[PDB]
Design a protein around this ligand. Structure first.
Ligand SMILES: Cc1ncc(NC(=O)Nc2cccc3ccccc23)c(-c2ccccc2)n1
Length: 301
């Protein structure tokens, strides 16, 4: 459940008059999301755009616990939470607006299968350096979460956002199971598992740790270098469970250099203790991302 799992009060408040709903961005089972104009929120701006999550009994208690946890979780690679609006209904969670939407959508639209300007990025597919800076920012957010001993449980590019200047942050508005339903395997009733992103211990033993998140980051790295393609896309849900439990590893993407694939393989160690830490996976990717173009052009053959 993301934030709910970590839970199981200096929360900032915003007045309803200060939030002006413009239009809907999306809608799901737990509520909807709107683009809104927010007044007197941040100085030297006066007015600014935000993404507003509108709460669709215990929901109100869950909301406050979610808000308190979101007020703690503040980092440069975690979508910014501004506060809540509790005067009247619907209850609202206010976040920064990320112009390019979710990371999956952004990757697919800058991939070889895209339909067809470029303010933040060049024409045609994202270069090696562009793919690496994306990876590094996600890794950095996971470093902060592991640092606060937070277990994400649903790390995937659909659960990352992209803003102006290609800034990548971990975050979502709780609509992934509705917008990307084929990225989940429905067990029974409401329970939906992101099995393609899960390690063997989470599928087999139903264990979720800091180490199962590292495996998911490994899969997120694969999605980055495959321009948002679904992992094990050629397989059904039961076929994918079989491959994961039998120790099978996703193939090296075409755009992926062997050095990047070594980071992936290290995230995909069957033994959770054997998995390379996220503090090291980030340190490894950052170094690669800011490395000179002479060194980088050599990496990509
Ligand atoms: C039902 C549902 N499913 C999934 C949801 N995603 C998360 O809770 N995930 C997240 C993990 C870790 C850091 C986060 C930081 C920002 C935003 C989401 C974060 C939500 C949710 C509920 C309230 C605010 C937003 C998202 N609600």
């Amino acid at each position: 459940s993301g934030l709910q799992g970590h839970i199981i009060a200096c929360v900032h408040h915003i007045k309803r008059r200060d939030i002006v709903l413009k239009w809907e961005l999306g809608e799901g089972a737990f509520g909807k999301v709107f683009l809104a104009e927010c007044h007197n929120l941040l100085p030297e701006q006066d007015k600014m755009l935000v993404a507003v999550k509108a709460l669709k009994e215990s929901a109100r208690q869950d909301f406050q616990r979610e808000a308190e946890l979101l007020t703690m979780l503040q980092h440069q690679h975690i979508v910014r939470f501004f506060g809540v609006c509790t005067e009247g209904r619907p209850l609202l969670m206010v976040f920064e607006y990320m112009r390019h939407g979710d990371l999956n959508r952004f990757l697919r639209s800058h991939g070889p299968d895209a339909k067809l300007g470029g303010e933040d990025v060049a024409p045609g597919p994202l270069g090696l350096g562009q793919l690496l800076a994306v990876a590094s920012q996600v890794a950095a957010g996971m470093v902060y979460l592991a640092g606060l001993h937070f277990v994400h449980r649903d790390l995937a590019t659909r659960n990352c956002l992209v803003g102006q200047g290609l800034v990548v942050k971990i975050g979502d508005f709780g609509m992934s199971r509705d917008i990307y339903s084929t990225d989940y395997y429905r067990v029974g009733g409401r329970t939906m598992l992101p099995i393609r992103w899960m390690p063997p211990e989470s599928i087999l033993y139903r264990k979720f740790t800091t180490e199962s998140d590292v495996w998911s980051f490994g899969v997120v790295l694969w999605e980055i270098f495959t321009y948002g393609k679904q992992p094990w896309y050629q397989l059904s849900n039961t076929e994918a469970i079989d491959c994961i439990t039998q120790g099978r590893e996703l193939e090296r993407p075409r755009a992926c250099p062997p050095e990047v694939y070594a980071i992936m393989r290290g995230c995909w160690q069957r033994e959770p203790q054997q998995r390379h830490s996220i503090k090291d996976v980030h340190a490894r990717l950052q170094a690669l991302a800011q490395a000179p173009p002479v060194y980088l052009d050599v990496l990509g053959h």
